Amino acid sequence: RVLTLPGTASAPEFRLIDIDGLLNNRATTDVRDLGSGRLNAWGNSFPAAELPAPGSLITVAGIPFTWANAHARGDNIRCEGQVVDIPPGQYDWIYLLAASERRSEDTIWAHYDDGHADPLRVGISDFLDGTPAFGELSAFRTSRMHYPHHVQEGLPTTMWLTRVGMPRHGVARSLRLPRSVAMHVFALTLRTAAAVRLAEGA
């Protein structure tokens, strides 16, 4: 048997997390910083010219993000189990812009104000002309890749939008990123919980 009923969802709110103080790695370079790339162990990096302007507000698949205000020693978070404070509240989804040195999967911990913590599964696909193994959406696909001594034509660098749910009906206070040098986080936006009910008909 089949029963489908129309619903209505509220207007949730997007909280764009300032990660500028956690930046610890350089994965993007310009033609004059080619030797500073540390996206992978071979010294590769994203092309800056094909990525957003530092500090700009962008939208990937409708989801808003702030591009990191990079310093010369960091333009993203290479994941080392950092704890990230978030505005306390009731949430639905975590959205990350990320890439990994080869595909990997790991855990984001979510910490709630009554001491409960939840281990949340996250997968991030490869930066190297990747394909989304976890059902990620594509955030960026460059034309070129940067190497320590040249700009490589016809080699896409890939970044992903990945989605992590927070099932618990409770107030979240912080998150822990995975402990894996392979994983790179470039932006982090959280989405609030919103109310849904049956709509007009039925």
Partner: protein, 332 residues
């Protein structure tokens, strides 16, 4: 001649897949059916395509369940005569080359790395090559460039502590499917899964670390070494090399399970596929943590030990899921 590779894979599976596709064989079936872990101390070489194969041939081991086998050859000339004869015979030669001398590779005149590609046509001025590793290329190449690559000395390179110091040696690989292929029905997939699991669980030989017990002992030995020391450097170089194509096989095996899961609509096969892919992703934590300690001196023994036991646990979870899958596909 069709380009074929996967993001977890190297030129080893990729060149063999091209050869397999040309004879009418599905590379996911032939190369994705077997799934194992083995390590022989002293066996590895600094090549992108190293895989421990004894007592079988390189292709025979990578295609455990098919009559596919391979032979290595060394051409003794200064030219490409032995390759013209092989093509004339209908063979597709797989050439051992140095990326340093291939104009279409990013490593060209930057980095020495031992590599494989498919040769598919030889004129008197140009060699036609096919190479699916990103950035994929397929077409003609100046014959002098090919000969420089095919004959390179691959001297030790400070920018490739993994695939340098292995001379190309003008050697090449012949492959052949030497008889009827098995019908890939549900019983066969059942037996393939059960044999992979039984091999993983069994007690290793004295001379070879194999399966789940071998992987445990291997990872324990790795974590015991002192980071920064010479023993740790050679150990981490071996780790990154031998685990590329082992990780490759895990990702290929999961695809083999996904494909048959869709074919017969057996969710036990997709659930097991997810377990096997988790082992593939577990290798990333171990490999990359070792890779950055070896190359950039990022010494993190706690992370390396943490990814290691996570890998073992994922392997233990996979094996259990694979057994439920084999039960759902067939009665034993």
């Amino acid at each position: 001649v069709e380009l074929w590779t996967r993001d977890l894979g190297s030129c080893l599976h990729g060149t063999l897949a091209t050869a397999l596709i040309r004879d009418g064989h599905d590379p996911v079936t032939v190369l994705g059916a077997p799934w194992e872990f083995r390590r022989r101390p002293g066996a590895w070489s600094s090549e992108e395509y190293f895989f421990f194969a004894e007592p079988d041939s390189l292709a025979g081991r990578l295609a455990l369940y098919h009559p596919f086998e391979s032979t290595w050859h060394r051409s003794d000339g200064d030219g490409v005569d032995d390759l013209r004869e092989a093509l004339a015979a209908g063979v597709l030669p797989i050439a051992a080359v140095d990326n340093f001398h291939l104009p279409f590779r990013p490593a060209f005149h930057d980095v020495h790395a031992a590599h494989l590609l498919v040769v598919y046509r030889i004129t008197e001025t140009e060699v036609y090559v096919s190479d699916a590793q990103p950035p994929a290329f397929q077409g003609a190449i100046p014959l002098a460039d090919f000969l420089a690559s095919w004959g390179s000395l691959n001297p030790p390179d400070d920018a490739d502590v993994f695939f340098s110091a292995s001379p190309s040696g003008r050697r090449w690989l012949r492959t052949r499917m030497t008889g009827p292929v098995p019908e890939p029905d549900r019983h066969w997939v059942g037996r393939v899964i059960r044999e992979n699991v039984a091999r993983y669980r069994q007690e290793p030989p004295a001379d070879t670390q194999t399966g789940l017990p071998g992987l445990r002992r291997y990872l324990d030995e790795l974590c015991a070494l002192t980071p920064g020391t010479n023993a740790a450097s050679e150990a981490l170089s071996e780790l990154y090399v031998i685990s590329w194509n082992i990780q490759a096989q895990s990702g290929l095996h999961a695809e083999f399970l996904r494909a048959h899961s869709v074919k017969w609509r057996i969710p036990e096969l997709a659930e097991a596929a997810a377990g096997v892919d988790a082992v593939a992703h577990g290798w990333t934590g171990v490999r990359m943590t070792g890779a950055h300690s070896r190359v950039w001196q990022r010494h993190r023994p706690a992370e390396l030990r943490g990814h290691a036991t996570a890998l073992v646990r994922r392997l233990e979870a996979a094996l259990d899921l694979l057994e439920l899958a084999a039960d759902a596909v067939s009665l034993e």
